[PDB]
Coordinates of C-alpha atoms in Angstrom, one line a residue:
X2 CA -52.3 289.4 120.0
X3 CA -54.7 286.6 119.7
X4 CA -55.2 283.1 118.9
X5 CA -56.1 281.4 115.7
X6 CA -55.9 277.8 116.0
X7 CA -52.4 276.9 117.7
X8 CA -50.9 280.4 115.9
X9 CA -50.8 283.5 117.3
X10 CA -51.9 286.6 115.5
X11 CA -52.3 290.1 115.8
X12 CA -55.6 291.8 115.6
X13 CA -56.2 295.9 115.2
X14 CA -58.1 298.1 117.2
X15 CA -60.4 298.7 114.2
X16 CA -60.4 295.1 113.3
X17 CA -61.7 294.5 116.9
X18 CA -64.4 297.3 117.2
X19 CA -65.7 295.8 113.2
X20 CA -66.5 292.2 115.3
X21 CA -67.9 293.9 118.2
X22 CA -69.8 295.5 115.6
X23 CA -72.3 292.3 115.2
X24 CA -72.9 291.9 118.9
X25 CA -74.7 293.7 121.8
X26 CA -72.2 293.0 125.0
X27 CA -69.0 292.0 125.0
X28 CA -67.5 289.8 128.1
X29 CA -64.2 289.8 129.3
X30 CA -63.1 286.9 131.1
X31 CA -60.1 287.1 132.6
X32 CA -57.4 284.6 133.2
X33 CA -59.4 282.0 131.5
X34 CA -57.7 279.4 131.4
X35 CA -58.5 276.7 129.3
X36 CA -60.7 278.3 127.5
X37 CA -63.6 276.2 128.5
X38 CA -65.4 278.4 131.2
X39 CA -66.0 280.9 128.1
X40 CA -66.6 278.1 125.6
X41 CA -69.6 277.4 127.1
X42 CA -70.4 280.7 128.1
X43 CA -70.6 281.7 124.2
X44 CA -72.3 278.7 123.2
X45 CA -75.2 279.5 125.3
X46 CA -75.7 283.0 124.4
X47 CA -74.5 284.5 120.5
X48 CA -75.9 288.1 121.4
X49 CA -72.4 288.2 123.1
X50 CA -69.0 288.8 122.1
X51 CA -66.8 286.6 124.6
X52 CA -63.4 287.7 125.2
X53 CA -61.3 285.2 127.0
X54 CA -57.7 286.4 128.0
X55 CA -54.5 284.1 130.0
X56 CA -50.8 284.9 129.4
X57 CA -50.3 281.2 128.7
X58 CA -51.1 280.0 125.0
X59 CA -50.3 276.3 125.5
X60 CA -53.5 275.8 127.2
X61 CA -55.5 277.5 125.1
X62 CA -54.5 275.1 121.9
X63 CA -57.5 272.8 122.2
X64 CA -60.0 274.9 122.5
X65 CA -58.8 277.9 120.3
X66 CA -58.4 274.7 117.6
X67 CA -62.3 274.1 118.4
X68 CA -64.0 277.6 118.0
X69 CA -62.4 277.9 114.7
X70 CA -63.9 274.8 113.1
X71 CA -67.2 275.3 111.3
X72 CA -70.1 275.6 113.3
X73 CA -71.3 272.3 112.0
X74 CA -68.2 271.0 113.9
X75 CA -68.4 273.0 117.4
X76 CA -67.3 276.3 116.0
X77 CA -68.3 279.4 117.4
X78 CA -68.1 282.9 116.1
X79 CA -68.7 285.1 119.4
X80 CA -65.4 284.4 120.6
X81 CA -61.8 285.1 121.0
X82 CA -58.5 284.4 122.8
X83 CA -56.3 287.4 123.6
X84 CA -52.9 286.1 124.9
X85 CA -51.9 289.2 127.9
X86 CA -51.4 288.8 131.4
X87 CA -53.1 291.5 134.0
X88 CA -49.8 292.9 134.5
X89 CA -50.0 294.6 131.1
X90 CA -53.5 294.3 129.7
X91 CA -53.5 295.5 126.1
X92 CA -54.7 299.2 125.4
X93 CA -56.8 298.1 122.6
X94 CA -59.6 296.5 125.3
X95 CA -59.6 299.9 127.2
X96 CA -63.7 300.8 128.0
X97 CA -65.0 298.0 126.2
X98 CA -66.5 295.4 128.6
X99 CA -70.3 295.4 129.3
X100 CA -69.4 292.6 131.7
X101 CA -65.7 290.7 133.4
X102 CA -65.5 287.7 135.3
X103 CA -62.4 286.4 137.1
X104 CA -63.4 282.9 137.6
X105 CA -60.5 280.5 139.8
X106 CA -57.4 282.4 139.8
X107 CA -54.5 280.7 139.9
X108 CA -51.4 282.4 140.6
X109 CA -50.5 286.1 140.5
X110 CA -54.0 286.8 139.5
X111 CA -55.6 285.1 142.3
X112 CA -53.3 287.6 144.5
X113 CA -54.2 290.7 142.5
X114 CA -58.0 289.7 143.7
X115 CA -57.4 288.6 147.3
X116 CA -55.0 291.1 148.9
X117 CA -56.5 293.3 146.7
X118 CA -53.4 294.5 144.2
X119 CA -55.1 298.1 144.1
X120 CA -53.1 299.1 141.3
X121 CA -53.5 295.5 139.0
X122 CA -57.7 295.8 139.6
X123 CA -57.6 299.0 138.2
X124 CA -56.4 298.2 135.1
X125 CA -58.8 295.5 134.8
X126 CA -61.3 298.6 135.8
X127 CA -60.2 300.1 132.9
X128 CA -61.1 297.3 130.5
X129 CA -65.6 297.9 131.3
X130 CA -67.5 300.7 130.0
X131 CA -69.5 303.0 132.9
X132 CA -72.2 300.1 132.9
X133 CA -70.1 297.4 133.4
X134 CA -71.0 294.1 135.9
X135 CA -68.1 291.9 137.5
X136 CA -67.6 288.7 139.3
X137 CA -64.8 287.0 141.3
X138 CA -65.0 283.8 141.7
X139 CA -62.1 282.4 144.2
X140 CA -61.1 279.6 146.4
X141 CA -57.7 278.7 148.7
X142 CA -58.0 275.9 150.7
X143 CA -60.0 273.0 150.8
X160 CA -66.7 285.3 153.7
X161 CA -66.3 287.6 156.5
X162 CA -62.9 289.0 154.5
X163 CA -64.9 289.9 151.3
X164 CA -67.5 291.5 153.4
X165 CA -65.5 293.8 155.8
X166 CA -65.0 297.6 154.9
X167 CA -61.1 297.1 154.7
X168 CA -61.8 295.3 151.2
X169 CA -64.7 296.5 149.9
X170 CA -63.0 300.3 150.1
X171 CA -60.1 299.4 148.5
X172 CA -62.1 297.3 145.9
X173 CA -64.1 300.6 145.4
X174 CA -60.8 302.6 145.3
X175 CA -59.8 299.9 142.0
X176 CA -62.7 300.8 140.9
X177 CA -65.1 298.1 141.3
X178 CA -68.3 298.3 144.0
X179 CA -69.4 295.1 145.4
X180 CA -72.7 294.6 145.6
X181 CA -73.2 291.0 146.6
X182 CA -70.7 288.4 147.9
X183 CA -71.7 284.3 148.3
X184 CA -70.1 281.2 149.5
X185 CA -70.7 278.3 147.1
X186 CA -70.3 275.1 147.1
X187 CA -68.6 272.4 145.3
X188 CA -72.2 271.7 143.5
X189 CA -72.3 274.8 142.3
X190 CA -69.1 274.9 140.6
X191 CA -69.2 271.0 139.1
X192 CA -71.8 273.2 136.8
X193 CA -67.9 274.9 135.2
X194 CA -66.6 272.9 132.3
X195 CA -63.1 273.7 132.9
X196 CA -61.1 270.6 133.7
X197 CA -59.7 273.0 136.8
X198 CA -62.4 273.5 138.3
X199 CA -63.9 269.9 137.6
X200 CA -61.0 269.3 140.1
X201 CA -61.8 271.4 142.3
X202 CA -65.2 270.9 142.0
X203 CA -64.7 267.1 143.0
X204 CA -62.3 266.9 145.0
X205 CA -62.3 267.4 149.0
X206 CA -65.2 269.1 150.4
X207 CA -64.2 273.1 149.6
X208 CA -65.1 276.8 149.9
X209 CA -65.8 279.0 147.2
X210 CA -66.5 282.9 147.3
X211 CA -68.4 285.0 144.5
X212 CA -67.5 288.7 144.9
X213 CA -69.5 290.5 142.2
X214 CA -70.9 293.8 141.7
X215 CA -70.5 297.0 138.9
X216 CA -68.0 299.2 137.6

């Protein structure tokens, strides 16, 4: 289930490993959004193979319209839009992620990551191969939680070890080309946490 253009399409486990094929890493971001965050993550580096997932299509139009023009016309080939949400992540990305990033959940998602949702973060778990590297990025209103033992355990129990957490500021996230976190990024002075570590 993936995004060509403004239609949605299916693509087959074989299909899939043939693209991964021409790449070293595959990324897995998830929730992405707009598609932008992984836009420019892709366009920066072609030695990987950027997987951007979000349950809603309608915002992934523009730039899923984009990536599939010629590269003379802001195409890009390292990338692809899967349309799931975590609640049922498709089997066909199981062990496959040298790297995921969860960058400003909105939502559901942003709940899966905060409380933790033990059960939802492990089937993101399931999604990297033994390697694997993550990062949460998250904010709620405009560090001591992601630090304590309470949540790094039950992060571990999901399957992800922390090895590094970081407040950032708005700055650092006016950096993100997604039109969400441009908002967040200028609006009122705000708090941002990067919880990021391996599989």
């Amino acid at each position: 289930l993936i995004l060509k253009g403004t239609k949605t399409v299916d693509l087959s486990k074989d299909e899939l490993t043939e693209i991964i094929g021409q790449f070293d890493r595959v990324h897995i971001d998830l929730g992405t959004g707009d598609g932008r965050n992984i836009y420019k993550l892709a366009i920066n580096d072609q030695n990987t193979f950027y997987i951007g997932i979000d349950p809603v299509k309608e915002n992934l139009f523009d730039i899923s319209k984009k990536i599939i023009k010629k590269p003379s016309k802001g195409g890009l080939s390292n990338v692809v839009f899967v349309i799931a949400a975590a609640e049922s992540l498709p089997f066909e990305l199981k062990n496959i992620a040298d790297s995921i990033s969860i960058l400003f959940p909105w939502g559901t998602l942003l709940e899966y990551v905060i409380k933790p949702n033990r059960d939802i973060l492990s089937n993101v778990a399931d999604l990297a191969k033994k390697e694997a590297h993550f990062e949460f990025v998250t904010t709620y209103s405009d560090k001591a939680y992601f630090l304590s033992e309470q949540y790094k355990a039950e992060l571990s129990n999901s399957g992800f070890r922390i090895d590094d957490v970081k407040e950032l500021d708005n700055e650092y996230v006016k950096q993100f080309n997604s039109l969400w976190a441009k908002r967040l990024a200028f609006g009122r002075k705000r708090s941002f946490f990067r919880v990021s570590g391996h599989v």
